[PDB]
Design a protein around this nucleic acid. Structure first.
Lengths: 87, 332, 332, 87
DNA sequence: CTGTTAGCGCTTTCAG
DNA sequence: CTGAAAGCGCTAACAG
């Protein structure tokens, strides 16, 4: 349901990394939203995510909530890791 | 291949109104009878025809995109931005290079609409009054991406090249700079004249340092315009203490020509760029720059166009996107 | 509504077949009528829908073009030469990035094919065996660009990568080089193991200047990898007086790399890249790089393909466009 | 009918410059020909011109033969220099 | 669920 | 030269 990472990639949550993340988080029924610096947005939306302006070293919180909620987290954690934007 | 939908309607021994359903994951169709047909489908080698459907349903699931030049890194990344998203949303795109020249944009826009697109992503550096007369006549959604629009009448996507202008320079004022020059691109270009210089300017008047009209030396966006803009600015007079460049490829020239005369970039003259393209790290003292996410613009642009094409009323047809400063080592 | 073939039929008072023959500009339809029709036409503002006509004619006048990454300098230029010529030939180009990865290339092919292209410019960094299989069974022509596959079963455009490399090393050998290394892209991709390393190797065993498998360091194609491939190679016992980088960006990362370490690129160790993208000029010692005509590959890759679609046949399905080097400051 | 030019443009007869010389010779019915280094190619074939690899400094002979030869020659002169490839 | 009936907007053999 | 049906393959109302 929840997890906090720190983007350590120099592009932050941008370009492909963010699409591959949303995409990665757009294949789950459970809800999912990314929060940061006060704003919270649907982590399933490309307009939402790229609004935040998340730069490197930024801290973010991913929250999933639904029947898939469980795996929802493992999945995005991996992609955060293997796509190497957040660890 | 030629085994048409009807050919399959036989193997599956069902109608065609039915395979039409299986093919598109339709509203209800027995799991056994659906995987029964979809079964004899692959058996053959049937390949649904996207043109037969286009015709029968007045939608092609293909957008048309018109950028100046996919050869220049700027657009290409922007283009990448669009493609990944159109694909994410099962859309094919049609790409065409206009080269910023008035006619092709309209020709293309015609061939485009004529080719039955489902939406258009247009991008140019000077969106003429005619373009709006033009673009507003289209029969499908249209959005600009990082494209200079005036009446904010047709949906656009971009970052305040004005603020980003101000924010960038301010950084320089805050450090003790009274003699800060400004290099730029073609003056007959909105991004420049319209927002670039505007930002630069007010930046100074806001701090009390009216600016020498000459201090706005310009040139074609290459590395050539760099050693060019430098040599001129330097020897000329006053020998500014800091520069600001309208892009990254120029800022580079700004940096070598400054090292050529003899100055020290990190120190003597602090430079700063706009865009922050790959090359922003590929230089002597890595160039501090104002971040412009060309990929998010394109990504977003396409996404907006996605809503419109799916009729959802996602308002705020004017989208701004966070820009930012990245000081690597260039600016003390 | 939007306007039909039948519409012009009334306003021109001719038969839909007459209207069709002028839009198509087919031979013979008296100048008297061909004229009448054309007025009824541009005044009524007709625009024929390419979809309806596709179905009718089995031709869409548009080609698919799988491509690794359009954002990348190398393919962006390749994709412009293509488009450039596809326009010249009244052809529209559908386009989707494949990411060099085997499964996408195969999904794009059917999405493309079912979309009904009329030709396919395929281009990858690693043609597979199953690759030539589905390509040979395609309904429409095809040709590879900046891509190479063994058997030569498919039409294609490309450069002599073996010689292209061998000449680079040679330029050095003859100059007084015994120790020269090779920083390269992914060795697991044929462009490297099959022709790049071979070229490099032979060049040495040719002048009888043997090779330590160590000197062949592997990076990705990133600026950083270039900084990493030099520091590794400088961390060698007997350091190489010269290196050969399989890319210009990579080579740019090798140059700065040595500089940030303590060597001044020209003397301490000469550096020669490959491709000759604009970048070569943007570097301190302007980068000497083997030249590859990116625009020409696509230009030619596409024009060739027009021959095959346009039924004409000309012999040379395996074109090798010439190469050469450009000695800048980076080395002698 | 013809002329000999000193290709002086850095990229020679390549890329965008080249793709135009090949377009302009296609707007005229006459037979246009380009010889270089002793081999000849239809000035109207992109696959032919592009495959020679004319470098800066090469000497090429553009030749027109037909009804409009002149319009074209007078044409592949303007283009040549408006595109700065030869003299 | 699933058929049935019509075309979508062009282009084409053929005819005259 | 210039009409005249005959549909390209599909999907879309609407039955059943």
């Amino acid at each position: 349901a929840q997890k906090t990472f720190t983007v350590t990639a120099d592009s932050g949550i941008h370009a492909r990394p963010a699409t591959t993340l949303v995409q990665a988080a757009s294949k789950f029924d459970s809800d999912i939203n990314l929060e940061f610096n006060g704003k919270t947005v649907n982590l399933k939306s490309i307009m939402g995510v790229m609004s935040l302006g998340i730069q490197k070293g930024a801290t973010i919180t991913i929250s999933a909530e639904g029947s898939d909620e469980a795996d929802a987290l493992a999945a995005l954690e991996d992609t955060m890791s293997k796509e190497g934007l957040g660890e | 291949m030629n085994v048409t939908i009807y050919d399959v309607a036989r193997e599956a021994s069902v109608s065609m109104a039915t395979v039409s359903r299986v093919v598109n994951g339709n509203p209800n169709v027995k799991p056994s009878t659906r995987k029964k047909v979809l079964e004899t489908i692959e058996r053959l080698g049937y390949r649904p025809n996207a043109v037969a459907r286009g015709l029968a349903s007045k939608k092609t699931t293909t957008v048309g995109v018109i950028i100046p030049d996919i050869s220049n890194i700027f657009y290409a990344e922007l283009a990448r931005g669009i493609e990944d998203i159109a694909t994410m949303y099962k859309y094919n795109i049609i790409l065409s290079n206009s080269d910023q020249n008035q006619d092709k944009e309209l020709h293309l826009l015609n061939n485009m609409l004529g080719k039955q697109v489902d939406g258009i992503i247009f991008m140019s550096g000077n969106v003429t009054e005619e373009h709006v007369e033009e673009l507003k006549k289209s029969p499908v959604p249209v959005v600009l991406a990082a494209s200079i629009e005036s009446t904010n009448q047709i949906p656009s996507v971009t970052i305040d090249y004005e603020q980003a202008a101000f924010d960038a320079v301010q950084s320089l004022i805050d450090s003790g700079h009274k003699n800060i020059a400004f290099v730029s691109g073609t003056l007959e270009e909105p991004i420049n004249h319209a927002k670039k210089v505007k930002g630069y300017k007010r930046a100074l008047t806001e701090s009390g340092l009216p600016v020498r009209d000459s201090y706005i030396v310009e040139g074609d966006y290459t590395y050539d315009s760099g050693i060019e803009a430098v040599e001129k600015l330097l020897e000329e007079d006053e020998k500014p203490t800091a520069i600001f460049v309208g892009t990254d490829e120029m800022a580079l020239g700004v940096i070598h020509g400054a090292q050529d005369r003899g100055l020290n970039v990190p120190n003597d003259l602090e430079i700063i760029g706009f865009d922050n393209t790959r090359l922003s790290t590929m230089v002597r003292p890595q160039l501090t720059s104002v971040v412009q996410p060309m990929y998010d613009i394109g990504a977003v642009a396409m996404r907006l166009l996605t809503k419109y094409m799916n009729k959802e009323t996602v308002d705020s047809s004017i989208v701004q996107l966070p820009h930012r400063i990245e000081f690597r080592q260039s600016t003390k």
